[PDB]
Each structure stands twice: as structure tokens, then as C-alpha cells.
Design a protein around this ligand. Structure first.
Ligand SMILES: Cc1cc2nc3c(=O)[nH]c(=O)nc-3n(C[C@H](O)[C@H](O)[C@H](O)COP(=O)(O)OP(=O)(O)OC[C@H]3O[C@@H](n4cnc5c(N)ncnc54)[C@H](O)[C@@H]3O)c2cc1C
Ligand SMILES: Cc1cc2nc3c(=O)[nH]c(=O)nc-3n(C[C@H](O)[C@H](O)[C@H](O)COP(=O)(O)OP(=O)(O)OC[C@H]3O[C@@H](n4cnc5c(N)ncnc54)[C@H](O)[C@@H]3O)c2cc1C
Ligand SMILES: [Cl-]
Ligand SMILES: [Cl-]
Lengths: 521, 521
């Protein structure tokens, strides 16, 4: 059943709905059906914009419910329990249906809304499974975005019978129009690339007719832009493809460590990178997502990059510069206070809180070192570690535990970020041991949870470490000849703009060397 | 005896004398004395500003000659033959005496002119020795700069007797005021550091009383400036010492690959780096040369940096960022056409010569790849390799030998760069096999001979590769705990401004990590 903290979190999330949401259930006399009925009734009382209706006559699984807006039959459907690890999947399905935007690439969202064709997806999950959430969330978002795409996420614990009849060997297990589609972790980009394989739009057909490149750079944040300038300066045929030019820089509000520029803005630096790239002959391709790398069958041959849009670009050398997603706490309040107290930048804004109190989320070496540094300039620091013991090396723990102005909370998970509409003013978190919720007043929150390199699409194609970073050497060479990598998606120790531009340059020079050594004279 | 090409080169060099030079010989009846007499008479006929006088009554070795200006007794003295590998040492002694400036650090020159005290140096060399030239040249420059410093460079082939009486075991062998001073390769900085050890000036005594730093950065070109910004942003006590702020950037005229800046000037970028560093609390120390690194005796202890001026700075961590000297052809015309056709930049100015002819000096992988690239955009390329066979990998040779617009000259050494007062117009070089001199008309010369990392002062203290580059890993860690390195003085594969600033940042973050792990709480 929903426990007290899930109800508290859900209420906070739902205050944000801008459009009404209706939960339509189809139930039978089973015990599980009674749990679902009680669950939906409990969710509906948390918000004025959410209502519960039941129609036991519909030709759908029992129990199951549709998440939609009044007056429509559009939306994802959950068959069985949507709690456990799918709680966040349920929260997102409610918020997106209620008008909340997705954080996915805008070009990807647009391609999903334009998908032609009918696709009925079904995904089997288990409440304890850790990789099902991403898959369920990706397909639910597609169903919210395009009425021609249906999705029913099925709880394997409730429809145990189906899992044996259909040979499901592991979760998450996805079927589309009756046939196996995929198993295991999958990103929205990879799902879209696999399903929208028909006559591609104008953009795709055009890309398919481009001549092969001497170097194609994938991703256009600072590392890729830097590579593009260096390559074009050598006069070779250069392609730079990416989702949106500028990478993380574009949305950054204040930057004070891009060497030689005391202070600039994300939009202006991104614009300057664009102007530097436009000073040369570079084919800049925007609004495209690379979905697959197919290595050259021979030395001096061509590598291929497939895109989500269905096109295939080809080149003599490749530079991967897709960056990384920066992990969130995923709690109510976080998005709203995104530029008003919640800080994700790895090495900035500390002097901003001199004389104030802050928190650091994460107890690994970076988290503990971030606390030690902040302790030197802020009035106070609260550090929250999810595990029962800090993960940092011993020597760091010993030093952080000797600082009077720092408090270490173990076995804790943030449950909410509080504000007054203008700035952050506190956070609430939960003691994993006892379930109790505690509050703490503060002006800043430094999230230092981790990074998620945008490299899943390269799985099995280039060697990566356990965290997903592409392994490179000093020359930015990968495990595949002619393929290089630069920036935050690689094993480079620190993630900064000036570091990424320097890596992009190195990768471009290595690719140039590789080209002269292998290109036919 | 002087051969025809040495006479040709010397005549070209001496056209540049601005002040008259007098060669004063003291000779005996020996055969070697007759050679010296003929040599000096031959040099004096090559220039209106050079005269030969002999005074066999002076209390100096026979044969020997003083290189000075009329009316003075100041200058270096050569005892025996000044030819063979000392030819360039003789050329420099003539030019400096004739008013030509040294390319050494200005602060170093100033310290030499201010040396108090009398020092009579003697250096034994052999005509075939390869490391004697630098030592002889360093001491000769000191004697030209300060009358209280005398130097007599002695040809061991002529004074064979002395070499056995004084136990000389190898050359170069230096004595000062009668006592052994040093043996082996030595730089001017290291010689000055060892001889000027008295009551240091005001600057030094002041430096000695500075508190220990949390990080001291040695060298203030782009890598060191970047490190300084990153360190100060962490709020630690940061010192940045260097000879002259800006490093190679300061004298660069046009820069078009500093990412995000389509085009700027060396003076302006250097100024911007200075402004970024001044936005924080960094103790910037100029006009100082590090001469020795003394590693901390214990973890968490202090490393020491000794300076040529006699001071000792100390710090918990050190970042070495001293860059590299870029090798020259060392021929008449080169200096004068420094910014007018002769290009040393590793990856710039190629499109500048579209439709024109150029040369590339150097046949290693960089030289051959530079030729292949230029061949794509210039009308013609002549590549000169000193050795009898290109050193580049086979695959590169095969490709460069298939390009019709490129000519490869093996067994060659440039002897002169020609111009019309405004721009380069050609070069002459010599065929090592036959001695013949050839000319070639052209508008550009790309020198790609090699780099000389400014790391000799670190010999034996940090591990370096055969070329003198400090070995580092991805985190910029060296072979000594708490000492990091960044930029052109390290093993980083490519030497560029944007690459160096990114490395400086990495090194600063690694030093910060090291500091939190070892500094007492
Ligand atoms: C909120 C915030 C503030 C920050 N502030 C600073 C700061 O002040 N100073 C600083 O130095 N650093 C800062 N950083 C870190 C800095 O932004 C990164 O280190 C830098 O942007 C990394 O550059 P990059 O080129 O490697 O990758 P990114 O900038 O991530 O760019 C990669 C690009 O590739 C795109 N892409 C991803 N996958 C694909 C695919 N499959 N196909 C095609 N394109 C794809 C991405 O969408 C993106 O546009 C900040 C980071 C954050 C999150
Ligand atoms: C003529 C020319 C043009 C160039 N043009 C470009 C270009 O357009 N774009 C580009 O990207 N790159 C260019 N480069 C290369 C670029 O300048 C270098 O890669 C860059 O300056 C390296 O920075 P650095 O900080 O490592 O070292 P450097 O700039 O060399 O600076 C090291 C500093 O340390 C000082 N120092 C040395 N020894 C000591 C000591 N013992 N104690 C104290 N201080 C010391 C040096 O004198 C110097 O000031 C050019 C190079 C040359 C020679
Ligand atoms: Cl940052
Ligand atoms: Cl360059």
C-alpha cells in the first residue's frame, strides 16, 4: 500500500499539475484489484486535479488503470502494482499527463510526436527491478506524446501467468504489436531509433546523401566544437552533429572559470563557440541523435553513425563527444529551484554562500572533499550519505569528522527541497533506518551524486569503464582504430569546460594524424 | 682552417654588427699559433667592423685571443681552436660583443649585470664535444655582460697538457677562481644560480620571508595561469612564479585557435589571462627563475623551490609549468625574418601560403605530416631532412613521396634564410655529402625541428623521458608525491594554448585533492 512518505511526496508533486488528470480503472474481484482501487482513491484525494473513475466493462487486463485527461482515451496504462521501484514511473506518468515537460532532447520529442504508424507496446516489470524504470518511463512518455502509440506496463508479480506463457526470461521485457522488441536497459533514444524505421523525413533522406566525411564529430558541446575548429583548420571535410549546439554550457547562467574570461554567460559562450566553428568550413548538423556506431570493416574504410531519425552518416574517423547527464535527487521542489539554490556545477558557487548554511548530497570522495572545501567558507555544512557508511577513502572521512561546522548524516535520502518561491530555504530527508522525516533550513544544496555518461548507445562497440565512461589514452584514442573521444563522456578525471575544449583539440589532432596515415593518397 | 661555407655564413652574420669588435691575439711560434693568426686575419677581412691585433707580451695562454671592443679589456677569451662544434660559440661571442642581444630571460640578464664579486672562469672543451657549446656560450655571455666576470674557453686539443695536470675527466669541465665548478651540461640559469649565492637583493630576502604556500605554480604561461585561477577558486594560498607572465603567448602576433575566440593577439590574450588571475587572491611573482626542486622529506611536509636569485620558496604542493624552448635552424637571416616568413607555430599559418612555395625543416613524423598537409593548400613544398634518410614512419614516407608538389631533400642543413628586408624570399642549404650550397626561392619556412622542454633544472628530481618531457599520468601526477606538471614541459602529445590551459586546470584540481588528503586538519 502507499505509505506515509510516498503520500507526502506525491501530494507535493501533484500541487504542480496544470491540467486535470483522470485515473480510469478496470477491476475484478481479486485481492490485487482491491489494492489498486484503494491506491487510486488515495491518490485522487491528494489533489484537486486528479480524479478516479472505474469502468469494469472495458476489454483490458484486470486490474489495470489508464492515466489520461478527462474526455480522452490517450495515455499509458499500468496493469498491476505501480509502486515499489515504479513509484517514480507513476509520478512521471501523472506529471507529464498533467502538462509537465520532459527533459529529453527537444528534437527527440518532436520526432516522437511525428511518428506515423500504430504501435501497441507492453513492458513486463517487477517492483524490485532496477533497470525497468527507465524503460517504463520512456514508453509511457511516448504514449503521452502520440495517441498512435499505446503502452501498458505490466507488473509481473500480478500477472505471473503471462510471464510464463510468453517466455519472459528477464525484466524489463518489451513487446510491440505482439512481437519481442527488446530486453534489458534501453534509453528513449534507442527505443525511438528502433521503432521509427520507416521512410525518414526530409532531413534524414538529405543526410543519407551527404558524401563521407574525413572526420565526423558526435555531440556539439565544448569538446565537439573545439574538435570541429581544429579539424577544419587542417582543411579536411568536417562534420559536427549534435542534439543542440552548446551542450551543457548553453543553459549555464554564470561561468567564471573559462580561462581568460573572468565572467561570461552560458548563452554568450555557446554563441562564441558557434562563431568560432562558423569561421571555418564545417557542416554543422543539429537536432540529430546518434543511436549506433558501426565500425569500419577494414583499415582506411568508413565508420558509420546511425541516427534516431533513421539516417546513416559515414566517415574515415570519428570523434565521440556526447557528454554526460548529471544525476538528480528526483524529489519535489528540485526542478523549481534549479537556478535558485540547488547547485550541480562540480567546482563553483561556494563563495556564494559565505555566512550561510548548505548541504552536500553524496558521500563519495567528491562529496566529502566538496564538504571540506565548503566548510572553509560557509557558516555550516550538512552532508547526506545514502549508504550506512561514507564511501570516501578513510583519510577523507577522518578529516571531515574533525570539522565542527560540518554535520554528517548517514543512511539518508532527500525527500524534498523547500523554497519561498524565490530561493531555496531548506530540505527534508528521510532516515532509511526508521522512516522518520527530518527538516533542515539552508540556502544551498550541492548535489554530488554522480554522472551518467551519454554512452549507452555505444555499449559493446567501444570499451567503457564500470561508470560508463569511454576509456581513452593521452591521445584520446579509444579501443577502435580511427575512433576518438573527448570530454565528459570519457575517463578524463575532471569535468570542466576548459578541460573539455582542450580534450576536443587533442582528439582532433590525433584523428588528423590517423587520417594522414590511412587515407589513400 | 675556416672552410668556404663557414666564411660565407660568418660574413652574413657579421653584416649585422652594430659596434666595432677587436680580436686581440697573444701568440707563440707554434704551428697552432700560426693557425689562429691566419683564422683571425681571415675573420677580420669579412667585416669592416672587425679588426685583428696581436700582442704577444700579455700574461695569458699562447695561443689565445680576446674578443672585445676597441679601448677595452672586457670580453671572453678563446685559447686554442674555436672552430668545430664551437663555431657557433665563436659566432655568438662576436655578435654579442658587436651589440646583438641575448634571447635569455631579461630578469636573468639583469641579475648577471648586477653580480658583485670577481669570478675568473675557465672551461675546457673539445671540438667534437656536443654539450660544450651551451656551457661555453653561457659563460661567454656573462663575460660580455659584466666586466667582473672573466672567462677563458680552452681547447683541450691544443692544451692537452693542462687537461692531464688538472685531472679533467670529461668535457665540458668548468673551474672558477681555481676550483672545480661543474662538469657536463649546464644551462645559464643553473650557472647563475650557483655562482651568485651571496647576500641576495631586496627581492630575494623578501621572498625568503613569505609564508609557505598551499600550492606554488612554477612558470606563468597559459598552463600556469590556468592552474592559478583554479587553485585560487578553491580559496587556498596560491603562488604563481615565473620569468615573464604570459609565456610564449605574449610574443605571438596572431592567434586563431584559442577556442571561443576567432582571432586575438598574443598581447591581448596574455593580458586577459593576467586579468583572470588578478580576479582572485594569487601572489604573482615575476622575474624569478626556478633553479632547483627539493622534495619534501615527509608526506604532508613542504617542497622547496630555489631560485637563480638565491631565494627559497616553500609549499605543500607544486605545479611545474615551465614550457619549452622551440629549436631554431641557427643560421643568418633567421632572426630578422622571425615574424615575416619563418614560422615555428606547430599548427598554424598554412592557408597563409596558398598559391605560394614553402619549405618544411625536419623529417620526423611531424615534419612529414606537416608537409603532407601543406601540400594540400600551397603551390609547392620543399622538405629538408638533416639525416641521410627520413626518420618518419614508413607509411608517412610512402605518402609524401607520392605527392607531385612536394620535394624531399635528404642529407641537408639550412645555411641561410633570405629576404628583401620585408619578407622571406628564399633559403640556402648545404648538401652534407658534397658540401655544395643550393638555393631555393620561397615565401615561407616551417621549422619543425624539435622542442626543448625547460626542465633541465629538474634533472634527477622528477622522471622525464628521453626528450626531457616530465612524465605525467591523466591526473598530471609526476614521479613525486605532491608535485604535478602541466603544459608543454610534460609528455602531453600536442603543444597548443587551449591544450595547456586545460592541463593547468587538471593539475590544479589534482593538487587540491592531494592537499585535502595530506594537510593537517
Ligand atoms: C548546471 C551546471 C553548471 C556547470 N557550470 C560549469 C562552470 O561554471 N564551469 C565549468 O568549467 N564547467 C561547468 N559545468 C560542467 C561543464 O558544463 C561540462 O564539463 C562541459 O559542458 C562538458 O563538455 P562536453 O563537450 O564534453 O559535453 P556536453 O556539454 O555535455 O555536451 C555533449 C553534447 O552532446 C549531446 N549529445 C548527447 N548524446 C548525444 C547523441 N547520442 N547524439 C548526438 N548528440 C548527443 C548533448 O545533448 C550535448 O549537447 C557545469 C555543469 C552543469 C550541469
Ligand atoms: C612562435 C609561436 C607561435 C605559436 N602560435 C600558437 C597558436 O597560434 N596557437 C596555439 O595554440 N599555440 C601556439 N603556439 C604554442 C603555444 O604557445 C604553447 O603550446 C603554449 O604557450 C604552452 O603554454 P605553457 O604554459 O605550457 O608554456 P609557455 O608558454 O612556454 O610558458 C612557460 C613559462 O615558464 C617560464 N619559465 C621557463 N623556465 C622557468 C623556470 N625555471 N622558472 C620560472 N619560470 C620559467 C617561461 O619563460 C614561460 O614564461 C605557438 C608557439 C610559438 C613558439
Ligand atoms: Cl564548475
Ligand atoms: Cl599553432
Amino acid at each position: 500500500m502507499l505509505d506515509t512518505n510516498m503520500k507526502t511526496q506525491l501530494r507535493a508533486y501533484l500541487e504542480k499539475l496544470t491540467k486535470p488528470v483522470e485515473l480510469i480503472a478496470t477491476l475484478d474481484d481479486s485481492a490485487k484489484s482491491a489494492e489498486i482501487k484503494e491506491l487510486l482513491a488515495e491518490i485522487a484525494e491528494l489533489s484537486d486535479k486528479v480524479t478516479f473513475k472505474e469502468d469494469n466493462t472495458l476489454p483490458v487486463r484486470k486490474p489495470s488503470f489508464l492515466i489520461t485527461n478527462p474526455g480522452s482515451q490517450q495515455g499509458p496504462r499500468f496493469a498491476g502494482s505501480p509502486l515499489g521501484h515504479e513509484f517514480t514511473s507513476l509520478v512521471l506518468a501523472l506529471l507529464w499527463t498533467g502538462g509537465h515537460p520532459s527533459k529529453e532532447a527537444q528534437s527527440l520529442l518532436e520526432q516522437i510526436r511525428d511518428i506515423d504508424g500504430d504501435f501497441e507496446f507492453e513492458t513486463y516489470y517487477s517492483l524490485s527491478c532496477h533497470n525497468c524504470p527507465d524503460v517504463v518511463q520512456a514508453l509511457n512518455l511516448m504514449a503521452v506524446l502520440n495517441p498512435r502509440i499505446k503502452h501498458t506496463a505490466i507488473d509481473g508479480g500480478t500477472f505471473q501467468n503471462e510471464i510464463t506463457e510468453r517466455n519472459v526470461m528477464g525484466v524489463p521485457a518489451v513487446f510491440v504489436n505482439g512481437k519481442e522488441f527488446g530486453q534489458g536497459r534501453m534509453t528513449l533514444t534507442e527505443i525511438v531509433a528502433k521503432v521509427d524505421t520507416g521512410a525518414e523525413k526530409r532531413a534524414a533522406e538529405a543526410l543519407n546523401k551527404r558524401d563521407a566525411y574525413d572526420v565526423l564529430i558526435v555531440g556539439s558541446g565544448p569538446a565537439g566544437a573545439a574538435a570541429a575548429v581544429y579539424s577544419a583548420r587542417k582543411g579536411i571535410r568536417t562534420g559536427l552533429m549534435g542534439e543542440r549546439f552548446g551542450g551543457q554550457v548553453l543553459d549555464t547562467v554564470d561561468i567564471e572559470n573559462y580561462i581568460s574570461v573572468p565572467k561570461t554567460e552560458g548563452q554568450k559562450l555557446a554563441g562564441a563557440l558557434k562563431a568560432h566553428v562558423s569561421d571555418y568550413d564545417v557542416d554543422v548538423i543539429d537536432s540529430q541523435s546518434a543511436s549506433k556506431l558501426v565500425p569500419a570493416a577494414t583499415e582506411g574504410g568508413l565508420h558509420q553513425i546511425e541516427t534516431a531519425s533513421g539516417a546513416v552518416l559515414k566517415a574515415r574517423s570519428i570523434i565521440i563527444a556526447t557528454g554526460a547527464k548529471w544525476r538528480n535527487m528526483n524529489v519535489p521542489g528540485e526542478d523549481q529551484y534549479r537556478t535558485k539554490g540547488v547547485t550541480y556545477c562540480p567546482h563553483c558557487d561556494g563563495p556564494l554562500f559565505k555566512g550561510k548554511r548548505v548541504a552536500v548530497i553524496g558521500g563519495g570522495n567528491s562529496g566529502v572533499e566538496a564538504a571540506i572545501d565548503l566548510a572553509g567558507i560557509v557558516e555550516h555544512v550538512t552532508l547526506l550519505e545514502f549508504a550506512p557508511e561514507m564511501k570516501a577513502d578513510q583519510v577523507l572521512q577522518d578529516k571531515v569528522r574533525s570539522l565542527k561546522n560540518v554535520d554528517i548524516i548517514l543512511n539518508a535520502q532527500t525527500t524534498e527541497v523547500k523554497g519561498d518561491g524565490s530561493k531555496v530555504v531548506g530540505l527534508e530527508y528521510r532516515d532509511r533506518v526508521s522512516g522518520d522525516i527530518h527538516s533542515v533550513a539552508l540556502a544551498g544544496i550541492f548535489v554530488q551524486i554522480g554522472l551518467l555518461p551519454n554512452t549507452h548507445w555505444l555499449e559493446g562497440a567501444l570499451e567503457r569503464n564500470r561508470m560508463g565512461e569511454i576509456i581513452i589514452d593521452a591521445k584520446c584514442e579509444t579501443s577502435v582504430k580511427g575512433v576518438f573521444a573527448a570530454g565528459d563522456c570519457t575517463t578524463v578525471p575532471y569535468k570542466q569546460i576548459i578541460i573539455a575544449t582542450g580534450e576536443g583539440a587533442k582528439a582532433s589532432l590525433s584523428a588528423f594524424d590517423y587520417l594522414i596515415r590511412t587515407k589513400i593518397a
